Amino acid sequence: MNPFASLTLTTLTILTIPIMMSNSNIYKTNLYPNYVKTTVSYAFTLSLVPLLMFMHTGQEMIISNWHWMTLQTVELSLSFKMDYFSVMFIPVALFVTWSIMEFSMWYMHSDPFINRFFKYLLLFLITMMILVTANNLFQLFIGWEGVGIMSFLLIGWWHGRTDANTAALQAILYNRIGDIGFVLSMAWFLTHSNAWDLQQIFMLNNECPNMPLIGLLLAAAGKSAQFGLHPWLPSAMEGPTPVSALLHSSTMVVAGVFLLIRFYPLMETNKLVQTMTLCLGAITTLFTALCAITQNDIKKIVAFSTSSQLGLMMVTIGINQPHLAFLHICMHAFFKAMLFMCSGSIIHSLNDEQDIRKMGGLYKAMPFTTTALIIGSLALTGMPYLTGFYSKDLIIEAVNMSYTNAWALLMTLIATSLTAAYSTRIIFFAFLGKPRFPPLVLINENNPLLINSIKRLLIGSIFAGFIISNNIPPMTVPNTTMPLYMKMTALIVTIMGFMLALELNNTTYYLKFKYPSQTYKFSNMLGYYPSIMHRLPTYHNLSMSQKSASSLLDLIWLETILPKTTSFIQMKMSIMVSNQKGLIKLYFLSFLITIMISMTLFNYHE
Amino acid sequence: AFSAPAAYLTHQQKVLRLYKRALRHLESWCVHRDKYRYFACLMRARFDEHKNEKDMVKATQLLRQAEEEFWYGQHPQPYIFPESPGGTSYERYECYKVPEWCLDDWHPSEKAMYPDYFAKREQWKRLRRESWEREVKQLQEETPPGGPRTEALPPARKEGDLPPLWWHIVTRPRERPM
Amino acid sequence: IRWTYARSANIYPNFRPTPKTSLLGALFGIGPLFFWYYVFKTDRDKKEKLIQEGKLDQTFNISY
Amino acid sequence: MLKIIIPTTMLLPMTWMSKHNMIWINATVHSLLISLISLSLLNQLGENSLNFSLTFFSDSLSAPLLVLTTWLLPLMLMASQSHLSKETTTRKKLYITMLILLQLFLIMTFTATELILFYILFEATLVPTLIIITRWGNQTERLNAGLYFLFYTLAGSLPLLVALVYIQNTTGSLNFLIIHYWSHPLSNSWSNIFMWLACIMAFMVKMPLYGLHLWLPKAHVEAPIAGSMVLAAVLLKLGGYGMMRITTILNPLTNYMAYPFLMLSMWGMIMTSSICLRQTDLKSLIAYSSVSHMALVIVAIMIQTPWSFMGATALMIAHGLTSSMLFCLANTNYERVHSRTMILARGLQTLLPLMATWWLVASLTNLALPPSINLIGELFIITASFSWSNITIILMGMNMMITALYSLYMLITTQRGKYTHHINNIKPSFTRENALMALHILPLLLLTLNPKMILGPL
Amino acid sequence: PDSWDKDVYPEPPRRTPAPAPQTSLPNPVTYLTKIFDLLVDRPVTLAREFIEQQHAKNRYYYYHREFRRVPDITECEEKDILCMFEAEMQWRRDYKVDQEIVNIIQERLKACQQREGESYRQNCAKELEQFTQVSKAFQDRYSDLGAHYSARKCLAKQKQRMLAERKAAKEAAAA
Amino acid sequence: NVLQIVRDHWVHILVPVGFVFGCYLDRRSDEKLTAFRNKSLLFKRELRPNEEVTWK
Amino acid sequence: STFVAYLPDYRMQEWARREAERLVKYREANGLPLMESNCFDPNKIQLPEDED
């Protein structure tokens, strides 16, 4: 019965088995991480088959297997979309997760709660698969919030440390700001198209209005950490290195971009939202690449690089090239995860040191890590015929040859120069020169888990671009004719960035000292954006929620008007009524007054 | 962290703290070792140039100017040791720290494992119970009538005494507990 | 104990109606309500007027 | 439906004839059996209600509420027996009698066919609650709380009574079926406006509506644990049930009489969510959470659409379970450290891991993580409000951001960080407390598995 | 299969092309699908055959319930409670059936959109038109009744629409 | 010896007995609302050759 | 939970689906519109005589 559907469902289903076994006598032993890693590897191998079927015949499906509930005219069912995006993303994510889990078997060996860590990693993977394969907006929202919560739990892994808890709550806050737009899109689609599934939404919206697309763009900006809601991604480096390599670099943070790739038929018919997406991506990639070039923590540099590449993906979506953006997601996963793993290897070798100013000459002391990091940097910069070339080069050429905002084009070119600049910074400060680490040398990368994981990701970073490009049907029209200088624009700007960064880094060897400029201060302190935006709005909100909502209104005026006034009035009237001297003279005079009044007021009128 | 603070810092203490801070931030600026050594020697010469100033007012004015210059020229992202209050591993292992009194609540089946450890624990508890009253008496004797004026505590002075208020210092969990 | 008591139970006994207290109470307890009432009433009046004229594009609007 | 009413009335003498050391066991066992029996009311029709007799009927709106009441009684019994160990036998039996009488009144309230019988039972629920609060509360403020609980209610309900009898002199009946079938529109006159207000304000103060909510933090903080459980889970839903019943005779006046209440609900939802961000008492935070969720329910009832009614039903059930669980979680820490200050005991995940898992799940359901029924109700109400006006997504959106914040804030304050050094009396969690948490949380996810049972008659 | 009516849920004749190999290399898809057949499809088929054999030895039936037609709300006197009750129940049943009709049409639309692939904008015109007509009729019948809907409010809505249409027709006649 | 057991656990029949009595009273209440049994326009039906009433 | 999961279909969802299937089949066979904007027959309705 056409094994496509059965295999696609089984790939997702078998990932949940260790979750069900987490209460057995394997979660209490030291064999649980290997069990989870083997399950993930088997899932990847199984998922390779539907990909082959699609590459042969272009086979696609939707499976609506379970009917959850039905409203009056709206039916909600558990449905999975098994189109090109799902069947291409699942093997890539599974391969990266396999490599990162094998890496974590070595990186987190001293953690007393490593089994919970693997259980956590698998839960994130399951939620991400639910997000990716969803066919209706409710299932997609389930995956959305699931990966958000898993990221919150994994960022605050060391929960006795204040900064980790702060970073986790910050990620939640920014993602909730995006979730507002997600919910707006859901409500608009249900009240205007009477559906939450993709098929009816595509049928009933030939010219989509602004509001649902703007909601989707807000959700994507939240999830992919675009300029307005960017700062949470670099702060998410508070978690362990495997979490950074898996969730916050290659798989989860592309989800927002993936969302816009899902709704590309609607975005194709709206010029204003496309322009907004393009400008947002351009400013994001420029700002993050500009922040990255002065950072001293290696994880911060790689995180800002990830944010800049997400901005480039948003730019690609903005010029109406969604398939190129998806291809770039797939290409970027490999070398970004490898770069994070190499950084983690360096950190573990140098007694958990993350500052590049205390990493000296590791080119000879750490040969395999040096080779992997060099290959990853070359792939990230779009060096010809590597994995990053087959997406980034085409993206740059498509941006050049389109009717587009000129400022966005300029910022894209400047950002793709700054990419090579910060890659040069990492390589120069971490691997070249003389040692700057403490004298007790414990450098050792001779461990089969680390070597095998990095080697797998390295083979991917070398060959995946060619393999995937030559095996997909063409969904776009190629830019066959271009001026030679515009064909070489990406290579030229990369070379200029390389040379300028090398010169400015070589100047550091001189015996000259000068106080920094204001531009350097702007770059290093992240445009002062976290300094102002995490102090002024938070202070005003909390101060108002104490002074006005709690004290002025709830504790004073709401008390004053209804209950306190009633108590005061009743008490005063009680004092007035009950305080009589008990002298018959006074109230017998009162009786006389009452009798006369009753004889005149009521009795005279009959 | 271990020493009891004083009521105020002296001029020499402030000068030395500024010297250490300036050298650390200069090392943050001067990444390479030889360049840092050169500029650190220059900084030391600049510091000991005005070492023999007998006028205290001029000394404090110089210190004020030096602190203003430091605040202007500080590295916005100085190097921090990973376990220092600003480091990447500052409070990483605090979630693994468990106070010792929790061991009193273990089920007897859990205590059936580790018999010798719990016998030693009982010995330590007996020692603490026997020493407490003498510690309190020594603190009562040694304290001035208007209450203590510093946070410094006395040592043991008698034959088999223990330094007062020692239990929670001696039975610290660990730096790497689990 | 003093902090929590001051933040909870000591507030009303130390409250006096003053021009500052009265003005801030009136503003922050009445202004938002009428602001949102005006916004929502204007929006719904516009929508109702559009519906009466028969130009709102209510096609496929089944669920409400 | 006497097959549910009579066994509770039998719980009464069974408790008063039990041996001194078997009261809790017998009460819990037979309460659970009564809940199992009441489970059969979920078999509902698509056209009309289950009309048992001239006096009692069951709808698709009241059956989940009855199931929740009967399920909450054993949980209250389990939560109460810890802090009542030192009590005398007679006073323990009196406490259990109060709980049983409250359950009986609620069961008869949710199924009464006539509005005056409903009113009588819905006022009769006041006495056991007030007695429980003012007799078994711990602090001196409980007395004041009791007064705030009483008059706030009665000042709303005394006008309603008048309106009710007036209606019976005009239409000749207060039977709900007759009232529904013989419905006539309300004209726009001052008399009709004041009739609308008399019919609405009692339920408004029961929800409670923002501005009329001051009784709730006092009553829900000063009460014993079972009192807080039953106040948050069931007694707040009396207002919503009564409003959804009474709105059938208020059209088309509601079309414009709802504006002040809608504005109050939305803005005060924002306000109470903000108040939760700066709260030093852990119980008061949960109370203000209840206020925000009930503001959402009020908006849903006021806009009068099928989607809003379904969302309101789901939200009431989900909130009942979640808020009861949160109150029990806070009570465990209070019984350990004898203080309600949130920052006193910190880093409890290091000392109590399974209780930390319970805390995480409860706070996840509070912020309406999908696909929980909390989220289903919230999303249905938000969609209906969006249809009512596209601008509401602003305020609702802000609420969704604030809720999670304070929810996680609570968790981060109690479970994470470092433990307080001088607190050395934190004993391991008892089997009773873990079982209480599980019996709260498992029905929530089970209901997620089959959500049409809590979606109401619409 | 025969489980559902193929006129209520129609499908196109399902044209699929024949394999046309152009390379001497073997097809991994064919080898993998042969393995999947032999290793998965046969044991499942045998289990289903056993289960169906067991089912055939115990064959019993259930029936679709039939409802006759009672007088509508239009034929009921103003205060006649029993006739109003029967008419209201009939109206609610009709409302549920209309909702299911809309659901069937929406299912057709969604299936056509998925089936037609890149040509859905042109190849799903008929299903879109059917959904447009059904949605317009359903919106005319039932929209804006609100919570606490009934047959009487539906009748009032229809009378109002009829009055407006009659007035518009007579005013256009005078043109 | 069953005397002590009975005098200690005779309170365990009160609630089941109440359940049975409530069921009986519900049947009695149903007995008083048969004015339209087999008389509605929707469900009116000819009697079987044996059965006396359509429902109890 | 088991008792609730297997509760018989008194909500008449399957009955309504089957009735709608029969109605759609009949109306599509005879070429009638699938649904009518009027749920009540106008011949049983008497409008007011005069609208002026």
Ligand SMILES: CCCCCCCCCCCCCCCCCC(=O)OC[C@H](COP(=O)([O-])OCC(O)COP(=O)([O-])OC[C@@H](COC(=O)CCCCCCCCCCCCCCCCC)OC(=O)CCCCCCCCCCCCCCCCC)OC(=O)CCCCCCCCCCCCCCCCC
């Ligand atoms: C051929 C056709 C194409 C033509 C292209 C253009 C032709 C020109 C070719 C070259 C152009 C650029 C050349 C390099 C630039 C200079 C680099 C540099 O670092 O100089 C040192 C100097 C500071 O050095 P430092 O402080 O001593 O370093 C600290 C230590 O070294 C600490 O050391 P460290 O270890 O920490 O490292 C510091 C770090 C970084 O050090 C820094 O922090 C300095 C940052 C400079 C690099 C930033 C470049 C990105 C520019 C984006 C701007 C977007 C608009 C922003 C607008 C702001 C609005 C306020 O150094 C690096 O890593 C290397 C930096 C980047 C090198 C690679 C350059 C590639 C990007 C730019 C060239 C693009 C090439 C292809 C173009 C393709 C287009 C078709 O930087 C500058 O002063 C110049 C920067 C330019 C800023 C201009 C903005 C205006 C400022 C005044 C505002 C006026 C206000 C008026 C009133 C308004 C009222 C409202």
Ligand SMILES: CCCCCCCCCCCCCCCCC[C@@H](O)O[C@H](CO[C@H](O)CCCCCCCCCCCCCCC)COP(=O)(O)OCC[N+](C)(C)C
């Ligand atoms: C702390 C929170 C407590 C709970 C909140 C309860 C909310 C209650 C608010 C009542 C909502 C509206 C009530 C009546 C509807 C309209 C009111 C009036 O302002 O509208 C105009 C009324 O016109 C003028 O405003 C006359 C009324 C002015 C006198 C009313 C006093 C209001 C002053 C504020 C006092 C605060 C009251 C609350 C005390 C706590 C409309 O013009 P008109 O078409 O002609 O009147 C419609 C009725 N007709 C058709 C029969 C004629």
Ligand SMILES: CCCCCCCCCCCCCCCCC[C@@H](O)O[C@H](CO[C@H](O)CCCCCCCCCCCCCCC)COP(=O)(O)OCC[N+](C)(C)C
């Ligand atoms: C500690 C370790 C934890 C992790 C390990 C767990 C190991 C695996 C176990 C987890 C199982 C995963 C759940 C996956 C769902 C499978 C079951 C599902 O398919 O059944 C549902 C059925 O679920 C039930 O319907 C929902 C349960 C009902 C909830 C009532 C709770 C009981 C009352 C308790 C007190 C009430 C308090 C709340 C008051 C409102 C589907 O219903 P339905 O689609 O129709 O079926 C159609 C066919 N039928 C109708 C013939 C049956």
